[PDB]
């Protein structure tokens, strides 16, 4: 019973690895040898946002590249203004332990999650003027890790009980549940088409999930440790992943294998959050040794090093027009780099 | 450009109101001392502090509030979560101390507790935090030894060749046999803690039980040790 299934499962995984090796005609770095290098990219701290009490775990830009939500462990959700360093809102949270925050594409709602395994949506267009809990979603068992808005009606969440759900905000129930992962699902990254997403779990395997169908299409098994953050390439045909083994990796949705690996011998610290740029030439990686390296996505060589934080860079964001790059670390300050 | 100047006045006024509120909360936040309660399922981690028992209830997390000598303490008991704990433990680096509770009655499950303690001690983000240790259910240890069959010497060969430490002070109404067992458990946790030799954090052992009122004062006193060592290290006295 259990031995014929696992033997069939092992012959299927040899077929997949034969496929992946037949398709591997060459590598990306050989092709890209006749490419002009980027050179040294030096960025300076244009702004510092000050006023948090505890460490800043996650943050998310707006679609107008103006207002960013920042989430902290003190129980405060502060909506910032990036140009004038003004706090346009400050929201007191029920649970002090927050692990994610999302900003709506219309700018009407903000969601937050955490160790209280409940996604809380806050309205920002109340006629009274006070922020209030619009609804609470208590379906998951494990902690809530990353949550992102598809629109004002449907939000996608990443729990810690190896399950991703598709929530409806109006009915308050789970539309589609994804139960493919075996390890703790760390973060999810929505596609620009908002039809697919990818989640990296702690089982060293990234999956490609269809929202409307409800099943995974592809499995990527190139890593060696816990996949911390995942981000799509801006065309929707590739993604990048950061893990604890100090290696960023680039994956293809068509070739179904790793294209390139971003590794250096001097740095052995983990990789917290990775965001592409607007063009996709610069890969930005928030490492665990208190600074950010600006990797070249086509040459695998560090342009430059963003050493401005006192503690580990917890999360990294890039505006939709690519104008600035904000990093939040565990010293409670948000540096805006340009 | 006159309308633009008027708009700036609006945002500036809003910022000032929000900023003053964040200062009032800053006073309350600094006065707040966070505590993480970690323990096994069999051991009574809920039974540790019966002094105040406010016991606010959330969905998964449990938070207990208790004040000692006008000093407010928040103790967060993590409840319904998945068994793997290597990712949500990173949140709790900002706490002042981590309360660890173990059950010494079951010797077979004691080994599991030692492994859990070793992982917490050697965790990179838990290096700054001190660990406050409670060796629960001491009364059960007394009654169990009287059976005549020594479980501990089976599970631990080191206890066939071990002497009572002269630094230890036994209670007068206890069997000397039972007192050897109590400190030998205690020494196991201290051997993991001395192996590292960081010097930034320490391990405070205590002999609690099921009916103890003094536990609130103990956690208060060990907090005084943790913040004094912090200042002393900062001025490089220690």
């Amino acid at each position, epitope marked *: 019973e259990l031995d014929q299934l*696992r033997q069939e499962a092992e012959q299927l*995984k040899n077929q997949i690895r034969d496929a992946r090796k037949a398709c591997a005609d060459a590598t990306l770095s050989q092709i890209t040898n006749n490419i002009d290098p980027v050179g040294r990219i030096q960025m300076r701290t244009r702004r510092t946002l000050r006023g948090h009490l505890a460490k800043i775990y996650a943050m998310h830009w707006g679609t107008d590249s103006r207002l960013l939500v920042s989430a902290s462990q003190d129980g405060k959700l502060i909506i910032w203004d990036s140009y004038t360093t003004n706090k346009v809102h400050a929201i007191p949270l029920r649970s002090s332990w927050v692990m994610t925050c999302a900003y709506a594409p219309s700018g009407n709602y903000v969601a937050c999650g955490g160790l209280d395994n409940i996604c809380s949506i806050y309205n920002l267009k109340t006629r009274e003027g006070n922020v209030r809990v619009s609804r609470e979603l208590a379906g998951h068992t494990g902690y809530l890790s990353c949550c992102r808005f598809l629109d004002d009606n449907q939000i996608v969440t990443s729990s810690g009980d*190896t399950t991703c759900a598709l929530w409806d905000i109006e009915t308050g129930q789970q539309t589609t549940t994804f139960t493919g992962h*075996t*390890g703790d699902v760390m973060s999810l990254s929505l596609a620009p088409d908002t039809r697919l997403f990818v989640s990296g779990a*702690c*089982d*060293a395997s990234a999956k490609l999930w269809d929202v409307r169908e409800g099943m995974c299409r592809q499995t990527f*098994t*190139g*890593h*060696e*440790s*816990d996949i911390n953050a995942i981000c799509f390439f801006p065309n929707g045909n590739a993604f990048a992943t950061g893990s*604890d*083994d*100090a290696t960023c990796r680039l994956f293809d949705l068509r070739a179904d294998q790793e294209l390139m690996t971003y590794s250096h011998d001097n740095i*052995i610290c*983990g990789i917290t959050s990775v965001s592409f740029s607007k063009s996709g030439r610069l890969l930005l990686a928030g490492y665990d040794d208190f600074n950010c390296n600006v990797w070249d996505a086509l040459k695998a060589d560090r342009a430059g090093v963003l050493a401005g934080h006192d503690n580990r860079v917890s999360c990294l964001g890039v505006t939709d027009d690519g104008m600035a790059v904000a990093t939040g670390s565990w010293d409670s300050f948000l540096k805006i780099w340009n | 450009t006159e309308d633009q100047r008027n708009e700036e006045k609006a945002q500036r006024e809003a910022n000032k109101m929000i900023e003053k509120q964040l200062q009032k909360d800053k006073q309350v936040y600094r006065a707040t001392h966070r505590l993480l309660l970690l323990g096994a399922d069999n051991s009574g981690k809920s039974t540790i502090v019966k002094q105040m028992r406010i016991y606010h209830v959330n969905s998964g997390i449990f938070e207990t509030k208790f004040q000692v000598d006008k000093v407010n303490f928040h103790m967060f008991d993590v409840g319904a979560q*998945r*068994d*793997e*704990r*290597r990712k949500w433990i990173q949140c709790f680096n900002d706490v002042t101390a981590i309360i660890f509770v173990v059950d010494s009655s079951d010797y077979n499950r004691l*080994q*599991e507790a030692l*492994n859990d303690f070793k*992982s*917490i001690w*050697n*965790n*990179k983000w838990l290096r700054t935090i001190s660990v406050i240790l409670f060796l629960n259910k001491q009364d059960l240890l007394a009654e169990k030894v009287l059976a005549g069959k020594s479980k501990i010497e*089976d*599970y*631990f*060969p*080191e206890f066939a060749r071990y002497t009572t430490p002269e630094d230890a002070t036994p209670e007068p109404g206890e069997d000397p046999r039972v007192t050897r067992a109590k400190y030998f458990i205690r020494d196991e946790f201290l051997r993991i803690s001395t192996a590292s030799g960081d010097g930034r954090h320490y391990c405070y052992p205590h002999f609690t039980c099921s009916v103890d009122t003094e536990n609130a004062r103990r956690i208060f006193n060990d907090c005084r040790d943790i913040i004094q060592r912090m200042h002393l290290r900062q001025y490089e006295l220690l």
Partner: nanobody
Amino acid sequence: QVQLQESGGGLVQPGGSLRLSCAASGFTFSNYKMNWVRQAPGKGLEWVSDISQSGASISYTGSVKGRFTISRDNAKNTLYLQMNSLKPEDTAVYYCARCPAPFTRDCFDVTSTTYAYRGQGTQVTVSS
């Protein structure tokens, strides 16, 4: 793909000898601390023993201390466990386990709810 393949075992006798071969494929073997974990029938997982990257620091479980040799070859990419002086009460399934982070000394691998850095295990029965 991280993969662990155990090898050796089967029905044996108490007091005999047995070598457990563990094959680690899909990662760099010298960077990660590795360790042994077993599961008794009708019981939970228990940490057998461990070995560091270089192989200097070696610790054991008390109730089976002095009865098991742990060899960790870096070049061969194999983890050997020597099992002499067996006991009929010490019969279980043996799973190779790997700590999830490189160059570290903390490990969380006693989880029974689908820990995804272990092998399929080998059945080792002792009949008196």
